[PDB]
Amino acid sequence: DATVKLGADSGALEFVPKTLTIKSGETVNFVNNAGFPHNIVFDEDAIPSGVNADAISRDDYLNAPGETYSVKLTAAGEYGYYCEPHQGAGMVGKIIVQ
Ligand SMILES: [Cu+2]
């Protein structure tokens, strides 16, 4: 399992780390750090076919400080995802599942 802080302590709205590599079946914990509310809307494109992004997409917004979203990715492949509220600011990421 690996943990992604949503936003740096400085206030910058970025996925930390932006490019994360995990193994098949590892859980990603997206812990709110700064800039909340945040959400994780996996992109339908640039992903394993079948639009699995929607099922693993966080439509709701994490608002409480330290709120953690835990998602298990078993399918191998890059997952290109982005934070909608800060999508224009470049708050995106990619999770290589092997
Ligand atoms: Cu954000």
Side-chain angles (χ1 to χ4, degrees):
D1 303 0
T3 299
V4 182
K5 298 167 62 278
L6 303 182
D9 299 328
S10 61
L13 312 173
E14 57 178 354
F15 284 107
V16 182
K18 179 173 182 179
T19 303
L20 183 62
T21 303
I22 56 180
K23 304 179 182 62
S24 181
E26 288 192 2
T27 310
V28 188
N29 302 273
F30 299 89
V31 186
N32 287 30
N33 172 85
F36 55 87
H38 302 285
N39 72 337
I40 311 299
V41 178
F42 288 83
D43 181 9
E44 299 191 10
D45 300 334
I47 196 174
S49 300
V51 191
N52 62 89
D54 185 71
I56 57 175
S57 290
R58 265 295 306 271
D59 300 358
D60 301 1
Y61 283 79
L62 296 75
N63 312 335
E67 185 178 352
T68 302
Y69 167 64
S70 300
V71 61
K72 305 179 182 179
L73 304 177
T74 59
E78 303 177 353
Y79 300 82
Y81 64 103
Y82 52 85
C83 183
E84 291 187 350
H86 314 143
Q87 182 179 4
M91 185 177 185
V92 307
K94 184 173 64 58
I95 290 163
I96 311 179
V97 174
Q98 302 178 2

XYZ file of all heavy atoms in Angstrom:
728
model
N 0.848 -1.225 0.000
C 0.000 0.000 0.000
C 0.868 1.253 0.000
O 1.981 1.246 0.523
C -0.934 0.005 1.211
C -1.819 -1.224 1.269
O -1.705 -2.085 0.371
O -2.631 -1.330 2.213
N 0.353 2.330 -0.592
C 1.080 3.587 -0.685
C 0.137 4.738 -0.371
O -1.062 4.668 -0.648
C 1.699 3.778 -2.075
N 0.693 5.802 0.202
C -0.081 6.955 0.643
C 0.265 8.169 -0.208
O 1.444 8.459 -0.436
C 0.187 7.258 2.120
O -0.195 6.133 2.919
C -0.596 8.485 2.564
N -0.765 8.870 -0.672
C -0.624 10.100 -1.442
C -1.221 11.236 -0.625
O -2.422 11.227 -0.319
C -1.308 9.995 -2.815
C -1.106 11.277 -3.611
C -0.776 8.794 -3.584
N -0.381 12.199 -0.252
C -0.848 13.431 0.370
C -1.465 14.329 -0.697
O -0.815 14.643 -1.701
C 0.305 14.143 1.073
C 0.936 13.338 2.198
C 2.262 13.932 2.659
C 2.101 15.333 3.234
N 2.051 16.390 2.184
N -2.712 14.742 -0.485
C -3.394 15.636 -1.417
C -2.983 17.068 -1.099
O -3.544 17.705 -0.205
C -4.905 15.459 -1.325
C -5.424 14.041 -1.572
C -6.941 14.010 -1.504
C -4.937 13.512 -2.911
N -1.999 17.577 -1.834
C -1.537 18.938 -1.645
C -0.372 19.038 -0.683
O -0.334 18.336 0.332
N 0.584 19.906 -0.993
C 1.730 20.111 -0.124
C 1.360 21.014 1.051
O 0.365 21.744 1.021
C 2.895 20.720 -0.905
N 2.184 20.953 2.099
C 1.967 21.814 3.257
C 2.098 23.286 2.890
O 1.466 24.142 3.521
C 2.955 21.456 4.368
C 2.800 20.026 4.847
O 1.662 19.512 4.831
O 3.817 19.415 5.239
N 2.910 23.599 1.878
C 3.085 24.983 1.455
C 1.794 25.601 0.935
O 1.704 26.829 0.836
C 4.168 25.067 0.378
O 3.811 24.302 -0.760
N 0.796 24.783 0.602
C -0.439 25.250 0.006
C -0.582 24.917 -1.462
O -1.678 25.089 -2.013
N 0.479 24.448 -2.113
C 0.381 24.053 -3.511
C -0.553 22.860 -3.657
O -0.511 21.914 -2.864
C 1.764 23.712 -4.065
N -1.404 22.908 -4.679
C -2.409 21.874 -4.919
C -1.840 20.908 -5.954
O -1.943 21.127 -7.162
C -3.717 22.501 -5.388
C -4.193 23.689 -4.548
C -5.399 24.365 -5.179
C -4.511 23.240 -3.133
N -1.232 19.829 -5.468
C -0.620 18.836 -6.337
C -0.697 17.471 -5.671
O -0.709 17.362 -4.442
C 0.839 19.188 -6.653
C 1.720 19.348 -5.424
C 3.161 19.658 -5.777
O 3.500 19.629 -6.979
O 3.955 19.933 -4.852
N -0.747 16.429 -6.498
C -0.661 15.062 -6.005
C 0.787 14.740 -5.661
O 1.681 14.890 -6.500
C -1.188 14.076 -7.046
C -2.685 14.050 -7.153
C -3.325 14.609 -8.246
C -3.450 13.455 -6.166
C -4.703 14.580 -8.348
C -4.827 13.425 -6.262
C -5.454 13.987 -7.355
N 1.016 14.296 -4.433
C 2.353 14.053 -3.911
C 2.452 12.583 -3.519
O 1.914 12.167 -2.492
C 2.661 14.968 -2.712
C 4.080 14.733 -2.212
C 2.457 16.427 -3.090
N 3.141 11.751 -4.322
C 3.842 12.094 -5.566
C 2.903 12.145 -6.767
O 1.843 11.522 -6.741
C 4.849 10.956 -5.715
C 4.165 9.789 -5.101
C 3.334 10.334 -3.965
N 3.291 12.883 -7.809
C 2.445 12.978 -8.994
C 2.400 11.652 -9.742
O 1.322 11.174 -10.115
C 2.950 14.096 -9.907
C 2.152 14.254 -11.191
C 2.591 15.481 -11.973
C 1.759 15.658 -13.233
N 2.163 16.864 -14.007
N 3.561 11.043 -9.970
C 3.665 9.728 -10.595
C 4.018 8.717 -9.513
O 5.132 8.735 -8.979
C 4.709 9.728 -11.710
O 4.377 10.728 -12.681
C 4.767 8.367 -12.390
N 3.074 7.839 -9.189
C 3.277 6.792 -8.199
C 3.249 5.431 -8.878
O 2.425 5.186 -9.765
C 2.202 6.858 -7.110
C 2.334 5.861 -5.957
C 3.630 6.082 -5.190
C 1.137 5.969 -5.029
N 4.154 4.550 -8.465
C 4.194 3.176 -8.946
C 3.855 2.236 -7.798
O 4.476 2.302 -6.732
C 5.571 2.833 -9.521
O 5.900 3.758 -10.565
C 5.581 1.417 -10.081
N 2.871 1.366 -8.017
C 2.476 0.354 -7.052
C 2.426 -0.998 -7.757
O 2.634 -1.099 -8.965
C 1.124 0.681 -6.384
C 0.034 0.874 -7.443
C 1.253 1.923 -5.515
C -1.329 1.200 -6.866
N 2.144 -2.039 -6.983
C 1.983 -3.389 -7.498
C 0.502 -3.748 -7.565
O -0.361 -3.046 -7.033
C 2.738 -4.391 -6.621
C 4.216 -4.074 -6.455
C 4.903 -5.090 -5.557
C 6.372 -4.752 -5.356
N 6.561 -3.437 -4.684
N 0.213 -4.862 -8.233
C -1.165 -5.321 -8.336
C -1.709 -5.661 -6.956
O -1.092 -6.415 -6.198
C -1.251 -6.537 -9.257
O -2.590 -6.977 -9.397
N -2.872 -5.102 -6.632
C -3.537 -5.370 -5.376
C -3.138 -4.463 -4.233
O -3.688 -4.605 -3.133
N -2.208 -3.538 -4.451
C -1.842 -2.576 -3.422
C -2.917 -1.508 -3.285
O -3.552 -1.104 -4.264
C -0.497 -1.923 -3.742
C 0.695 -2.848 -3.570
C 2.018 -2.111 -3.621
O 2.004 -0.869 -3.759
O 3.073 -2.772 -3.523
N -3.120 -1.051 -2.053
C -4.116 -0.029 -1.769
C -3.457 1.344 -1.764
O -2.403 1.535 -1.147
C -4.791 -0.291 -0.423
O -5.231 -1.654 -0.361
C -5.987 0.632 -0.233
N -4.077 2.292 -2.458
C -3.666 3.689 -2.435
C -4.552 4.416 -1.434
O -5.786 4.367 -1.531
C -3.762 4.327 -3.829
C -3.154 5.722 -3.817
C -3.078 3.446 -4.863
N -3.917 5.070 -0.464
C -4.596 5.909 0.517
C -4.366 7.371 0.145
O -3.266 7.897 0.329
C -4.083 5.614 1.924
C -4.255 4.159 2.313
O -5.304 3.759 2.821
N -3.224 3.358 2.078
N -5.406 8.026 -0.360
C -5.361 9.453 -0.671
C -5.772 10.194 0.592
O -6.959 10.273 0.921
C -6.278 9.785 -1.842
C -5.909 9.086 -3.119
C -6.423 7.834 -3.412
C -5.052 9.683 -4.026
C -6.086 7.191 -4.587
C -4.712 9.044 -5.203
C -5.230 7.797 -5.484
N -4.778 10.653 1.348
C -5.007 11.389 2.587
C -5.002 12.881 2.279
O -4.038 13.399 1.707
C -3.944 11.045 3.641
C -4.279 11.706 4.970
C -3.821 9.539 3.803
N -6.074 13.574 2.657
C -6.081 15.027 2.546
C -4.949 15.619 3.374
O -4.800 15.307 4.559
C -7.422 15.591 3.017
C -8.544 15.330 2.036
O -8.539 14.331 1.319
N -9.514 16.236 1.997
N -4.148 16.479 2.746
C -3.086 17.200 3.437
C -3.317 18.701 3.451
O -3.266 19.324 4.519
C -1.733 16.885 2.782
C -0.608 17.743 3.323
O -0.010 17.427 4.352
N -0.313 18.837 2.631
N -3.572 19.301 2.292
C -3.811 20.733 2.193
C -4.638 20.997 0.946
O -4.589 20.228 -0.019
C -2.500 21.524 2.144
N -5.396 22.088 0.973
C -6.211 22.451 -0.165
C -7.547 21.752 -0.250
O -8.208 21.840 -1.291
N -7.967 21.060 0.802
C -9.253 20.383 0.767
C -10.362 21.419 0.597
O -10.268 22.523 1.146
C -9.473 19.566 2.041
C -9.336 20.362 3.308
C -10.420 21.045 3.834
C -8.125 20.420 3.978
C -10.296 21.775 5.001
C -7.996 21.149 5.144
C -9.083 21.827 5.657
N -11.427 21.104 -0.158
C -11.829 19.774 -0.631
C -11.117 19.265 -1.887
O -10.780 20.041 -2.781
C -13.318 19.959 -0.920
C -13.433 21.376 -1.336
C -12.413 22.135 -0.530
N -10.899 17.951 -1.930
C -10.294 17.273 -3.067
C -11.175 16.101 -3.477
O -11.991 15.606 -2.695
C -8.888 16.745 -2.753
C -7.923 17.797 -2.303
N -7.357 18.708 -3.168
C -7.406 18.065 -1.081
C -6.540 19.500 -2.494
N -6.553 19.130 -1.226
N -10.999 15.663 -4.721
C -11.698 14.491 -5.226
C -10.809 13.806 -6.251
O -9.903 14.417 -6.823
C -13.051 14.859 -5.844
C -12.910 15.584 -7.167
O -11.873 16.181 -7.454
N -13.957 15.536 -7.983
N -11.082 12.525 -6.484
C -10.269 11.687 -7.359
C -11.194 11.142 -8.437
O -11.889 10.140 -8.227
C -9.577 10.551 -6.596
C -8.863 11.089 -5.350
C -8.593 9.829 -7.503
C -7.777 12.105 -5.642
N -11.209 11.795 -9.593
C -12.008 11.377 -10.737
C -11.050 10.762 -11.750
O -10.436 11.472 -12.554
C -12.797 12.543 -11.341
C -13.588 12.077 -12.556
C -13.721 13.146 -10.295
N -10.917 9.439 -11.713
C -10.077 8.748 -12.681
C -10.594 8.986 -14.094
O -11.801 8.956 -14.347
C -10.042 7.249 -12.377
C -9.238 6.893 -11.160
C -9.794 6.983 -9.895
C -7.929 6.460 -11.281
C -9.057 6.651 -8.774
C -7.187 6.129 -10.164
C -7.752 6.225 -8.909
N -9.670 9.237 -15.017
C -10.046 9.516 -16.395
C -10.521 8.248 -17.091
O -9.946 7.170 -16.920
C -8.864 10.116 -17.156
C -9.201 10.441 -18.599
O -10.393 10.372 -18.967
O -8.272 10.763 -19.368
N -11.586 8.385 -17.885
C -12.095 7.250 -18.649
C -11.083 6.789 -19.691
O -10.962 5.587 -19.956
C -13.420 7.617 -19.314
C -14.521 7.984 -18.332
C -15.883 8.089 -18.991
O -16.009 7.686 -20.167
O -16.827 8.574 -18.334
N -10.365 7.724 -20.303
C -9.340 7.398 -21.280
C -7.994 7.183 -20.590
O -7.808 7.509 -19.416
C -9.232 8.504 -22.330
C -10.529 8.720 -23.082
O -11.333 7.768 -23.170
O -10.746 9.841 -23.587
N -7.046 6.624 -21.342
C -5.712 6.326 -20.819
C -5.790 5.375 -19.627
O -5.033 5.494 -18.661
C -4.970 7.609 -20.441
N -6.716 4.423 -19.697
C -6.946 3.471 -18.613
C -7.316 2.126 -19.222
O -7.758 2.053 -20.376
C -8.068 3.955 -17.669
C -8.058 3.199 -16.340
C -9.423 3.798 -18.339
C -9.049 3.732 -15.329
N -7.132 1.038 -18.472
C -7.662 -0.253 -18.921
C -9.107 -0.148 -19.387
O -9.932 0.541 -18.782
C -7.520 -1.130 -17.677
C -6.251 -0.631 -17.052
C -6.128 0.846 -17.405
N -9.408 -0.846 -20.480
C -10.706 -0.734 -21.126
C -11.822 -1.202 -20.195
O -11.601 -1.941 -19.232
C -10.729 -1.550 -22.418
O -9.735 -1.100 -23.322
N -13.039 -0.754 -20.500
C -14.201 -1.028 -19.681
C -14.600 0.096 -18.751
O -15.533 -0.084 -17.959
N -13.935 1.248 -18.833
C -14.233 2.404 -17.995
C -14.384 1.970 -16.543
O -15.425 2.199 -15.917
C -15.501 3.130 -18.483
C -15.647 4.477 -17.784
C -15.465 3.310 -19.993
N -13.346 1.332 -15.999
C -13.304 1.054 -14.570
C -13.085 2.314 -13.745
O -13.266 2.275 -12.523
C -12.202 0.039 -14.262
C -10.821 0.551 -14.621
O -10.149 1.182 -13.805
N -10.389 0.278 -15.846
N -12.701 3.422 -14.385
C -12.411 4.651 -13.654
C -13.603 5.100 -12.819
O -13.438 5.542 -11.676
C -12.005 5.749 -14.635
N -14.813 4.995 -13.371
C -15.987 5.504 -12.671
C -16.184 4.797 -11.336
O -16.521 5.435 -10.331
C -17.228 5.347 -13.549
C -18.461 5.976 -12.932
O -18.533 7.222 -12.886
O -19.356 5.225 -12.492
N -15.976 3.479 -11.304
C -16.167 2.736 -10.062
C -15.162 3.166 -9.001
O -15.496 3.238 -7.813
C -16.054 1.236 -10.329
N -13.926 3.457 -9.408
C -12.880 3.872 -8.481
C -12.765 5.390 -8.393
O -11.825 5.901 -7.776
C -11.526 3.247 -8.859
C -11.141 3.620 -10.294
C -11.579 1.735 -8.696
C -9.760 3.151 -10.700
N -13.699 6.124 -8.990
C -13.693 7.579 -8.937
C -14.425 8.062 -7.692
O -15.507 7.568 -7.361
C -14.347 8.168 -10.188
O -13.538 7.960 -11.331
N -13.827 9.032 -7.003
C -14.435 9.630 -5.815
C -15.263 10.829 -6.254
O -14.763 11.948 -6.379
C -13.370 10.029 -4.800
C -13.108 8.990 -3.719
C -14.325 8.770 -2.825
N -14.819 10.012 -2.241
C -14.408 10.518 -1.086
N -13.475 9.924 -0.360
N -14.946 11.653 -0.648
N -16.553 10.589 -6.496
C -17.454 11.688 -6.823
C -17.560 12.669 -5.663
O -17.575 13.888 -5.867
C -18.832 11.141 -7.193
C -18.786 10.204 -8.384
O -17.686 10.006 -8.943
O -19.847 9.665 -8.761
N -17.631 12.155 -4.437
C -17.700 13.012 -3.266
C -16.347 13.668 -3.003
O -15.297 13.199 -3.448
C -18.140 12.211 -2.041
C -19.501 11.569 -2.224
O -20.091 11.722 -3.313
O -19.982 10.911 -1.276
N -16.388 14.772 -2.262
C -15.211 15.576 -1.966
C -14.806 15.378 -0.512
O -15.639 15.500 0.392
C -15.482 17.055 -2.244
C -15.458 17.406 -3.714
C -16.542 17.126 -4.533
C -14.348 18.016 -4.281
C -16.522 17.443 -5.877
C -14.320 18.337 -5.623
C -15.408 18.050 -6.417
O -15.382 18.370 -7.754
N -13.529 15.073 -0.295
C -13.000 14.903 1.053
C -12.796 16.275 1.686
O -11.961 17.059 1.223
C -11.686 14.124 1.017
C -11.732 12.679 0.511
C -11.873 12.622 -1.003
C -10.490 11.921 0.957
N -13.550 16.560 2.745
C -13.566 17.878 3.372
C -12.931 17.903 4.752
O -12.272 18.883 5.103
C -15.007 18.390 3.481
C -15.776 18.247 2.183
O -15.190 18.206 1.102
N -17.097 18.167 2.285
N -13.111 16.853 5.546
C -12.529 16.836 6.878
C -11.007 16.739 6.780
O -10.486 15.994 5.944
C -13.075 15.662 7.689
N -10.267 17.475 7.610
C -8.802 17.355 7.574
C -8.357 15.949 7.945
O -8.825 15.368 8.927
C -8.335 18.389 8.605
C -9.455 19.357 8.716
C -10.703 18.557 8.509
N -7.446 15.402 7.146
C -6.955 14.058 7.350
C -7.850 12.961 6.818
O -7.546 11.781 7.032
N -8.939 13.304 6.133
C -9.808 12.288 5.556
C -9.046 11.482 4.512
O -8.360 12.045 3.654
C -11.041 12.941 4.933
C -12.071 11.952 4.413
C -13.300 12.636 3.849
O -13.415 13.870 3.998
O -14.150 11.940 3.255
N -9.171 10.160 4.586
C -8.414 9.246 3.742
C -9.372 8.423 2.893
O -10.336 7.853 3.413
C -7.540 8.316 4.587
O -6.651 9.093 5.398
C -6.732 7.381 3.698
N -9.103 8.366 1.591
C -9.831 7.501 0.668
C -8.931 6.342 0.263
O -7.841 6.561 -0.271
C -10.297 8.277 -0.563
C -10.770 7.390 -1.690
C -11.886 6.579 -1.539
C -10.102 7.365 -2.906
C -12.322 5.765 -2.567
C -10.531 6.557 -3.940
C -11.640 5.758 -3.765
O -12.071 4.951 -4.793
N -9.387 5.114 0.495
C -8.596 3.919 0.223
C -9.184 3.196 -0.981
O -10.355 2.802 -0.960
C -8.569 2.996 1.442
O -7.998 3.649 2.563
N -8.372 3.026 -2.025
C -8.798 2.352 -3.248
C -7.806 1.245 -3.572
O -6.592 1.471 -3.555
C -8.913 3.333 -4.431
C -7.565 3.983 -4.726
C -9.451 2.622 -5.664
N -8.318 0.057 -3.885
C -7.485 -1.071 -4.283
C -7.534 -1.213 -5.800
O -8.616 -1.372 -6.377
C -7.958 -2.360 -3.613
C -8.043 -2.281 -2.099
C -8.552 -3.583 -1.505
C -8.675 -3.494 0.008
N -9.198 -4.754 0.601
N -6.368 -1.153 -6.440
C -6.237 -1.366 -7.878
C -5.569 -2.716 -8.112
O -4.391 -2.894 -7.787
C -5.434 -0.237 -8.522
C -5.979 1.173 -8.294
C -5.055 2.209 -8.914
C -7.386 1.306 -8.853
N -6.319 -3.663 -8.675
C -5.762 -4.956 -9.054
C -5.390 -5.041 -10.526
O -4.439 -5.749 -10.873
C -6.756 -6.078 -8.732
O -7.980 -5.857 -9.445
C -7.043 -6.128 -7.238
N -6.112 -4.340 -11.396
C -5.830 -4.385 -12.825
C -4.509 -3.691 -13.137
O -4.244 -2.587 -12.654
C -6.973 -3.743 -13.611
N -3.683 -4.346 -13.948
C -2.403 -3.788 -14.357
C -2.602 -2.721 -15.428
O -3.520 -2.796 -16.248
C -1.481 -4.888 -14.883
N -1.723 -1.719 -15.414
C -1.854 -0.585 -16.308
C -1.671 0.754 -15.624
O -1.729 0.849 -14.393
N -1.326 1.773 -16.407
C -1.370 3.140 -15.911
C -2.812 3.570 -15.665
O -3.715 3.251 -16.444
C -0.709 4.087 -16.912
C 0.731 3.731 -17.246
C 1.329 4.647 -18.296
O 0.581 5.471 -18.864
O 2.546 4.544 -18.553
N -3.025 4.300 -14.573
C -4.283 4.985 -14.296
C -4.006 6.481 -14.286
O -3.351 6.981 -13.366
C -4.876 4.534 -12.963
C -5.186 3.060 -12.897
C -4.192 2.136 -12.615
C -6.475 2.591 -13.113
C -4.469 0.790 -12.552
C -6.762 1.244 -13.050
C -5.755 0.349 -12.771
O -6.027 -0.994 -12.704
N -4.482 7.182 -15.312
C -4.415 8.631 -15.364
C -5.583 9.288 -14.658
O -6.727 9.128 -15.094
N -5.332 10.025 -13.578
C -6.401 10.615 -12.787
C -6.088 12.079 -12.513
O -4.958 12.542 -12.688
C -6.602 9.859 -11.467
C -5.413 9.924 -10.538
C -5.418 10.762 -9.431
C -4.287 9.145 -10.763
C -4.334 10.823 -8.577
C -3.199 9.200 -9.915
C -3.228 10.040 -8.823
O -2.146 10.099 -7.975
N -7.110 12.815 -12.078
C -6.978 14.249 -11.874
C -7.959 14.713 -10.809
O -9.010 14.103 -10.600
C -7.217 15.017 -13.179
C -8.509 14.648 -13.874
C -9.708 15.249 -13.518
C -8.526 13.699 -14.886
C -10.888 14.916 -14.151
C -9.702 13.359 -15.524
C -10.879 13.971 -15.154
O -12.053 13.635 -15.788
N -7.595 15.805 -10.138
C -8.450 16.443 -9.142
C -9.221 17.564 -9.831
O -8.640 18.594 -10.193
C -7.608 16.973 -7.983
S -8.539 17.718 -6.627
N -10.525 17.364 -10.018
C -11.339 18.336 -10.750
C -11.224 19.756 -10.212
O -10.916 20.664 -11.001
C -12.802 17.878 -10.741
C -13.063 16.630 -11.564
C -14.538 16.299 -11.664
O -15.338 16.921 -10.936
O -14.897 15.419 -12.475
N -11.401 20.018 -8.913
C -11.380 21.416 -8.452
C -10.081 22.118 -8.775
O -10.071 23.343 -8.950
C -11.609 21.295 -6.939
C -11.216 19.912 -6.596
C -11.569 19.080 -7.790
N -8.979 21.373 -8.861
C -7.673 21.932 -9.184
C -7.124 21.346 -10.478
O -5.916 21.419 -10.729
C -6.704 21.686 -8.027
C -7.287 21.995 -6.684
N -7.005 21.252 -5.558
C -8.146 22.964 -6.290
C -7.662 21.755 -4.527
N -8.361 22.793 -4.945
N -8.000 20.795 -11.325
C -7.544 20.231 -12.590
C -6.881 21.298 -13.448
O -5.878 21.033 -14.120
C -8.718 19.595 -13.335
C -8.330 18.927 -14.644
C -9.512 18.285 -15.341
O -10.652 18.404 -14.891
N -9.246 17.599 -16.446
N -7.428 22.514 -13.435
C -6.824 23.609 -14.170
C -5.475 24.031 -13.629
O -4.684 24.626 -14.367
N -5.195 23.735 -12.361
C -3.913 24.072 -11.757
C -2.871 22.978 -11.942
O -1.755 23.112 -11.430
C -4.094 24.357 -10.264
N -3.205 21.906 -12.653
C -2.269 20.830 -12.894
C -2.228 19.773 -11.817
O -1.268 18.995 -11.772
N -3.237 19.714 -10.948
C -3.302 18.698 -9.900
C -3.801 17.399 -10.526
O -4.978 17.040 -10.450
C -4.200 19.154 -8.757
C -4.211 18.196 -7.578
S -5.202 18.769 -6.185
C -4.835 17.489 -4.988
N -2.875 16.683 -11.163
C -3.164 15.396 -11.778
C -2.103 14.400 -11.329
O -1.122 14.752 -10.675
C -3.213 15.481 -13.318
C -4.170 16.577 -13.756
C -1.822 15.722 -13.886
N -2.320 13.138 -11.686
C -1.393 12.083 -11.325
C -1.598 10.863 -12.192
O -2.554 10.769 -12.969
N -0.691 9.905 -12.021
C -0.770 8.642 -12.740
C -0.230 7.541 -11.843
O 0.843 7.691 -11.249
C 0.023 8.707 -14.050
C -0.086 7.460 -14.910
C 0.584 7.653 -16.266
C 2.087 7.866 -16.139
N 2.763 6.735 -15.444
N -0.973 6.442 -11.752
C -0.614 5.306 -10.906
C -0.351 4.109 -11.809
O -1.278 3.579 -12.432
C -1.708 4.987 -9.876
C -1.766 6.088 -8.815
C -1.447 3.634 -9.227
C -3.044 6.092 -8.003
N 0.909 3.690 -11.891
C 1.284 2.499 -12.648
C 1.060 1.283 -11.755
O 1.750 1.115 -10.746
C 2.739 2.573 -13.126
C 3.014 3.923 -13.795
C 3.037 1.431 -14.092
C 4.438 4.087 -14.286
N 0.101 0.429 -12.116
C -0.156 -0.806 -11.384
C 0.483 -1.957 -12.145
O 0.241 -2.128 -13.345
C -1.663 -1.040 -11.192
C -1.915 -2.405 -10.566
C -2.259 0.059 -10.332
N 1.304 -2.739 -11.452
C 2.004 -3.858 -12.073
C 1.617 -5.174 -11.411
O 1.312 -5.218 -10.219
C 3.517 -3.650 -11.992
C 3.996 -2.369 -12.655
C 5.490 -2.167 -12.523
O 6.195 -3.005 -11.960
N 5.984 -1.050 -13.045
Cu -7.222 19.223 -5.175
